[PDB]
Design an enzyme around this catalytic site. Structure first.
Site, PDB file in Angstrom:
ATOM      1  N   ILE A   1      23.374 -10.720 -15.244  1.00  0.00           N
ATOM      2  CA  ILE A   1      22.688 -11.138 -14.021  1.00  0.00           C
ATOM      3  C   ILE A   1      21.540 -10.226 -13.681  1.00  0.00           C
ATOM      4  CG2 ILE A   1      22.886 -11.624 -11.548  1.00  0.00           C
ATOM      5  CD1 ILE A   1      26.033 -11.755 -12.216  1.00  0.00           C
ATOM      6  N   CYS A   2      20.352 -10.807 -13.633  1.00  0.00           N
ATOM      7  CA  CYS A   2      19.167 -10.098 -13.196  1.00  0.00           C
ATOM      8  C   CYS A   2      19.075 -10.243 -11.687  1.00  0.00           C
ATOM      9  CB  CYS A   2      17.917 -10.650 -13.881  1.00  0.00           C
ATOM     10  SG  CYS A   2      16.425  -9.755 -13.441  1.00  0.00           S
TER      11      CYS A   2
END
Lengths: 147, 210, 138
Positions: free
Chosen positions: A83-84
């Site tokens: 997850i960015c």
């Protein structure tokens, strides 16, 4: 174990965020099995998405580790589920807690980017062919999130 | 490289020029801190606690604000069981000054990663807490259309994030402790009040002056 | 001390596998980069000099069970090799005869395993063994 970690687990269980189940593993109190329902009105509606949360050695100095277990077509998520998100790297303060991260991920699902676009192959697809992207996410919700 | 250094001489700055000559005629000693973006909070944290080993008056006055500080942030919307452990570390340093400890004994506790960072966090929380109280006042001192709360989530609360006048004004007025910053390029924060903590700013560093 | 889960460990392993360690005589990476399960890994050993393995590229397959890294991975040669602990039909690595898999600690990584195999090719009872023809698989 810090008093921080034991108290955070107890408060997280005492007051659940609607649309998110999050049980700590009895074997590893630092690991959390997180499940998120795909927000109503999103391209992910009706899907249920598996995530995992880990509180590192340094916690709460270092940010938590979070990753999608379920394949998902989303700008902020990559092919391996990484997850960015700002509050998981640069912009994480020791004051922030898990439930912030947790529903922050949920907000992402509810209304996918960009308020400031990140540069990847999925996000580029959303930035132009949005209607096409939403139908892709709907399809990936079907074959990955719906059993 | 230490987190907080020994009371080094001001002539060591010629190793890194007529601008130091002007600095000598008003100062004598420097104290270096690790240039990791947490300088300001570690420098002020030592500068003021070291000065309280001489001043019992400001010590108990400082303790009264710091104790009441925890319940202040909770009344402001910070979850209590979050900041508890960084407050416990902050109060344990005030209790370590109250009990007469050496400057060398205090320094050894500031170079402990855990103890030091935990304090920097609470000092950042104190800064961030005060900026959000005086939210209406600081709104137009932030650039890029960032709100006060956002600026606090991005540049104040998180570790390893550089400090400028907005951080200094903020922490100063929160603990009611005046600061003066000297710029290796003079400014008093807040305006007019007698300075208690002297600091030297170089691009990326904050240093304790004496 | 503090247990790290399977998946968060394996992502680190991947990262380091991507950056490359030492010279490159050992390398690893996922068999499929869209595989969210993180189970099948591709190993690669360049044979150690002065041995009968020297200057041969040995491709391996490594599998990480649901319990990695608390219990060792299962390792298997794809490229044919003549080495103590490696099956002549399958290329499977016998867990007992390898000191890193038999004496498995949770701190060991797929890196550590690949170097350990590369070290054991230098052992006296392996370095001189006659080898099969090059570029040949099971």
């Amino acid at each position: 174990l810090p008093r921080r970690i034991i108290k955070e687990t107890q408060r997280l269980l005492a007051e659940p965020v609607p649309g998110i189940k999050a049980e700590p593993d009895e074997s590893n109190a630092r690991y959390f099995h997180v499940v998120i329902a795909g927000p109503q009105d999103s391209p992910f509606e009706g899907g249920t998405f598996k995530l995992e949360l880990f509180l590192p050695e340094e916690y709460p100095m270092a940010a938590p580790k979070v990753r999608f277990m379920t394949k998902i077509y989303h700008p902020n998520v990559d092919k391996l589920g990484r997850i960015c998100l700002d509050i998981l790297k640069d912009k994480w303060s020791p004051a922030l807690q898990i439930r912030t991260v947790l529903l922050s991920i949920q907000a992402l699902l509810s209304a996918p980017n960009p308020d400031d676009p990140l540069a990847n192959d999925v996000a580029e697809q959303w930035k132009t062919n949005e209607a096409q992207a939403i139908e892709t996410a709907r399809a990936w919700t079907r074959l990955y999130a719906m059993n | 490289n230490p987190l907080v250094s020994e009371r080094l001489e001001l002539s060591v700055l010629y190793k890194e020029q007529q601008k130091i000559k002007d600095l000598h005629k008003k100062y004598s000693y420097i104290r270096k801190t690790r240039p990791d973006g947490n300088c300001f909070y570690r420098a002020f944290g030592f500068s003021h606690l070291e000065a309280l080993l001489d001043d019992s008056k400001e010590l108990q006055r400082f303790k009264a604000v710091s104790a009441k500080s925890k319940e202040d942030l909770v009344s402001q919307g910070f979850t209590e069981f979050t900041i508890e452990d960084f407050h416990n570390t902050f109060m344990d340093l005030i209790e370590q000054v109250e009990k007469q400890t050496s400057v060398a004994d205090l320094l050894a506790s500031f170079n402990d990663q855990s103890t030091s960072d935990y304090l920097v966090v609470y000092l950042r929380l104190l800064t961030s807490g005060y900026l959000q109280r005086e939210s209406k006042f600081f709104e137009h001192f932030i650039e890029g259309g960032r709100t006060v709360k956002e600026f606090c989530q991005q540049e104040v609360e998180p570790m390893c994030k550089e400090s400028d006048h907005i951080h200094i004004i903020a922490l100063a007025q929160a603990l009611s402790v005046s600061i003066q910053v000297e710029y290796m390029d003079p400014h008093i924060f807040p305006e007019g009040s007698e300075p208690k903590v002297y600091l030297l700013y170089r691009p990326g560093h904050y240093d304790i002056l004496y | 001390g503090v247990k790290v889960p399977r998946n968060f460990r394996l992502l680190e392993e991947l990262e380091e596998g991507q950056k490359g360690v030492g010279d490159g005589t050992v390398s690893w990476g996922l068999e499929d980069d869209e595989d969210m399960t993180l189970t099948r890994w591709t190993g690669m050993i360049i044979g150690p000099p002065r041995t009968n393995y020297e200057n041969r590229i040995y491709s391996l397959k490594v599998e990480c069970g649901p319990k990695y890294p608390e219990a060792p991975p299962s390792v298997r040669f794809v490229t044919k090799i003549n080495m103590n602990g490696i099956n002549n039909s399958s290329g499977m690595v016998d867990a007992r005869s390898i000191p890193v898999l038999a004496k498995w600690q949770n701190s060991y990584s797929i890196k550590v395993v690949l170097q350990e195999l590369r070290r054991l090719m230098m052992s006296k009872e392996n370095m001189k063994l006659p080898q099969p023809p090059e570029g040949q698989t099971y």
